[PDB]
């Protein structure tokens, strides 16, 4: 039979059968209970709208993501999300399909063990396998080397790989991602008068960020230009009218990636943690990693980031090496495409964690040889 | 490739008239008189399928040879029968590899085209020497005058 390549993510759940080009169903991972009282009788009001249904009734819900930073903080809601994904968005019972979840690097063990225990006890799948979210993104590019920066919505991690041999001592995981950029944008919009507070209006700020923000090639020059002319002010129409005008908030929101001091984080930007991740590698594979830097994940879709990052790394790196940044147009679904490719391989067909194996060793089987 | 051409050449004028009337009814009101890559992509979006513009360009380049971006009558039928891929899996790799290895009766790693001639005599389909010539041109990618194993994989790749 065919395998189910699910990809929990944090912000958008992407799923679909193995062997295709794009995920079959992509929908936000939010579960929102209603918060008001409700007076109409017999309206058929449910107790929790999940997935894309709660992005249409969000006016009277309190949306809450079940995955904070890679890790899962609310297991009941995550179980509800998985149940919805299997039964309503794909309509395939899990009793007859292997599953291939994905997990960020350096995550707590208990999260992974609980994930496998749920998949084997509640949904009762035949066999499931957990894979690191960066190796798949490297599969999708058709490479076999390279250092991949997978800046998702929950957590940004940077896994270097050479000739198929991952370097476990050079993984640099940073917890700044799309959600913190949304919060920072929502916080700097208040400097013009627009106040978004409700958890429903966070979605509106996210839409503003997606449609308007861009990464500046040079920060100081843009700050000077936006403060003199008015060629940058782009307007946007809220879900009820009252258009708003975003000035130099456009390139200040995604600039937080390269200067995490804006949101008070100490660490260095995504332009310098990649160079540090390279320098921890051996001295003889640094040229190949320099030449095959891969971008993935949703947050790396800002217009103009593949040039800013290349300029920064070229500034840091030695002058002789060639710096090349691979930015495929299908960046958002790169991890899932790689997952489909991996699940479609014949050599991989014996790496699944078969159910009888789980019955013999318990949920701690995932840390064992079947990784 | 020309697989859909083969499939529809097996078919007859019934499919021709069928797809002609289907164009008449569904493409009613159009200004182009054919089906365009963007046209079919928007149609897929309207029905509920989600193709990508890059895929649209790829498929139209595959179906359109003259560069028009639309479909000739034969090309239109080929594209119409193309969207569904009923036949897949293209025979078996290992068995055909064995067949090809024994095809080199001299076992020199090279295929004598006289062996191809005898095998075709066994096939016996109405064919001229230029037809097998064109077939080899399709297969003999490096033009070495024989059938390379990798090129044997290539020309039989996915062949049912």
């Amino acid at each position: 039979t065919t395998a189910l390549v699910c990809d929990n993510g944090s912000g958008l759940v992407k799923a679909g059968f193995a062997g295709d080009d794009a995920p079959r169903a992509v929908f936000p991972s939010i579960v929102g209970r209603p918060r008001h009282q409700g007076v109409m009788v017999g309206m058929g009001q449910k107790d929790s709208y999940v997935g894309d249904e709660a992005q249409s009734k969000r006016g009277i819900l309190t949306l809450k993501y079940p995955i904070e930073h890679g890790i899962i903080t609310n297991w009941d809601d995550m179980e509800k999300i998985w149940h919805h994904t299997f039964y309503n968005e794909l309509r395939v019972a899990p009793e007859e399909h292997p599953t291939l979840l994905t997990e960020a690097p350096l995550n707590p063990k208990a999260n992974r063990e609980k994930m496998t225990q749920i998949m084997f006890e509640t949904f009762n799948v035949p066999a499931m396998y957990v894979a690191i979210q960066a190796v798949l993104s490297l599969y999708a590019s058709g490479r076999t080397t390279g250092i991949v920066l997978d800046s998702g919505d929950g957590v940004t991690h940077n896994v270097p790989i050479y000739e198929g041999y991952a370097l476990p001592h050079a993984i640099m995981r940073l917890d700044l991602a799309g959600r913190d950029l949304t919060d920072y944008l929502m916080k700097i919009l208040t400097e013009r008068g627009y106040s978004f507070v409700t958890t429903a209006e966070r979605e509106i700020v996210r839409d503003i960020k997606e449609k308007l923000c861009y990464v500046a090639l040079d920060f100081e020059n843009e700050m000077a230009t936006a403060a003199s002319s008015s060629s940058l002010e782009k307007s946007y129409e809220l879900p009820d009218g009252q258009v708003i005008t975003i000035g130099n908030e456009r390139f200040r929101c995604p600039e937080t990636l390269f200067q995490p001091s804006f949101i008070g984080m100490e660490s260095a930007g995504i332009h310098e943690t990649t160079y540090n991740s390279i320098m921890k590698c051996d001295i003889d594979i640094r040229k190949d990693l320099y030449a095959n830097n891969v971008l993935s994940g949703g947050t790396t879709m800002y217009p103009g980031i593949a040039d800013r990052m290349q300029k920064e790394i070229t500034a840091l790196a030695p002058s002789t090496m060639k710096i090349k940044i691979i930015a495929p147009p299908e960046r958002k679904y790169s991890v899932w495409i790689g997952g489909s490719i991996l699940a479609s391989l014949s050599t991989f067909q014996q790496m699944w964690i078969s159910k009888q194996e789980y019955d013999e060793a318990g949920p701690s089987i995932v840390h064992r040889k079947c990784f | 490739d020309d697989i859909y051409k083969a499939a529809v050449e097996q078919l007859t004028e019934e499919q021709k008239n069928e797809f002609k009337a289907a164009f008449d009814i569904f493409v009613l009101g159009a200004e182009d008189g054919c089906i365009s890559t963007k046209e079919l992509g928007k149609v897929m979006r309207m029905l509920g399928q989600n193709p990508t513009p890059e895929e649209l360009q790829e498929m139209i380049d595959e179906v359109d040879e003259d560069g028009s971006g639309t479909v000739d009558f034969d090309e239109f039928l080929v594209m119409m029968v193309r969207c569904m891929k009923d036949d897949s899996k293209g025979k078996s790799e290992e068995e055909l590899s064995d067949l090809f290895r024994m095809f080199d009766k001299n076992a020199d790693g090279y295929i004598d085209l006289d062996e191809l001639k005898m095998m075709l005599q066994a096939t016996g389909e109405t064919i001229t020497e230029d037809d097998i010539e064109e077939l080899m041109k399709d297969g003999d990618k490096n033009n070495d005058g024989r059938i390379d194993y990798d090129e044997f994989l290539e020309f039989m790749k996915g062949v049912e």
Partner: peptide, 26 residues
Amino acid sequence: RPTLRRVRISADAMMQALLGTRAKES
């Protein structure tokens, strides 16, 4: 690396999604 396509669902379903009410013969 091979590729598998499933978005190209069976052409009958595509024709139905295209036509709807007028999906009587095609």
